[PDB]
């Protein structure tokens, strides 16, 4: 049975959280939200540096930022030397969207993390880290 | 930092496993592979019943099975009463593709699960289950 595979059950949890995220924030996906968190944490960050926050490829991040910039969420400036390298900022409207979404995303995470104690949450984090490093 | 969010790090692990899965099996995604496992486990299963294995909506499963059936992987039969309700079987070619992919997917899972002991793997499974039930 697929219920006995750890990574199948992982996709069940990931899609349950994504479905709840899409219901509460239909206009801000998790990769879009995480990218905005990184821009607000480091204004003027290099566009390529947002790959880690996006957990995506260069093309997916380029398409994501182009749509975000078209929706008035982010603004970008090019390098005078290499006009392909870009620096990303949050627009004033983008900071309002991000500020309103942070408690919504936290409560969506709390719907699942709340079923775990503090020790179980930190232990879930350590298990996921060991599987990647 | 996003590295301190449990569900962001969960997406990092899920995309790392997906990227490795796409490199080893570029023509069989995880939702396609899991659906084929369910069909081989229950030949003639109802199409709607494959939603749990697909971890998707009805439209995503309908599009997935239509592409799979077009590629000669599955075959379908309709209900004489309600021709929209369908039963799914694996074609002879589909069983060859599934048999060859099972050890490939297992080794992809082992690339990450191998970093954990047996107790840590079962404990990762229990933590994910408690977050959903």
UniProtKB/Swiss-Prot annotation, chains A, B:
* Matching InterPro entries: HTH_MarR-typ, Tscrpt_reg_MarR-type_CS, WH-like_DNA-bd_sf, WH_DNA-bd_sf
**Gene Ontology molecular function: any one:** DNA binding
Q: What does the record list as coiled-coil region(s)?
A: none
Q: Which residues form the HTH marR-type domain?
A: 3-133
What induces or represses its expression, per the UniProt entry? Expression is modulated by temperature, growth phase, salt and pH.
DNA-binding residues: 47-70
Task: Give one Pfam family.
Answer: MarR
Q: Tell me the SMART domains matching this sequence.
A: HTH_MARR
Q: Does the keyword RNA-binding apply?
A: no
Top-level taxon = Bacteria
- Keyword set, alphabetical order: DNA-binding, Transcription, Transcription regulation, Virulence
Q: Relate the protein's function as given in its record.
A: Involved in the temperature-dependent positive control of flagellum-driven swimming motility and cellular aggregation. Regulates fliC expression by directly interacting with fliC promoter.
The cross-references to PANTHER family, in alphabetical order and at most eight, read:
TRANSCRIPTIONAL REGULATOR, MARR, TRANSCRIPTIONAL REPRESSOR OF EMRAB OPERON
Name recorded for this polypeptide: Transcriptional regulator HosA
Organism this protein belongs to:
Escherichia coli O127:H6 (strain E2348/69 / EPEC)
């Amino acid at each position: 049975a697929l219920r006995n595979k750890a990574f199948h059950q992982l996709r069940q949890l990931f899609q349950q959280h994504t479905a709840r995220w899409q219901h509460e924030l239909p206009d801000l996906t998790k990769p879009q939200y995480a990218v905005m968190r990184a821009i607000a944490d480091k204004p003027g960050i290099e566009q390529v540096a947002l790959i880690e926050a996006a957990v995506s490829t260069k093309a997916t991040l380029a398409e994501m930022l182009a749509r975000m910039e078209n929706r008035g969420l982010v603004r970008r400036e090019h390098d005078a030397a290499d006009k392909r390298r870009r620096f990303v900022w949050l627009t004033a409207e983008g900071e309002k969207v991000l500020a309103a979404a942070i408690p919504i995303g936290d409560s969506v995470d709390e719907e699942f993390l709340g079923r775990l104690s503090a020790e179980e949450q930190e232990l879930f984090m350590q298990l996921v880290r060991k599987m990647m490093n």
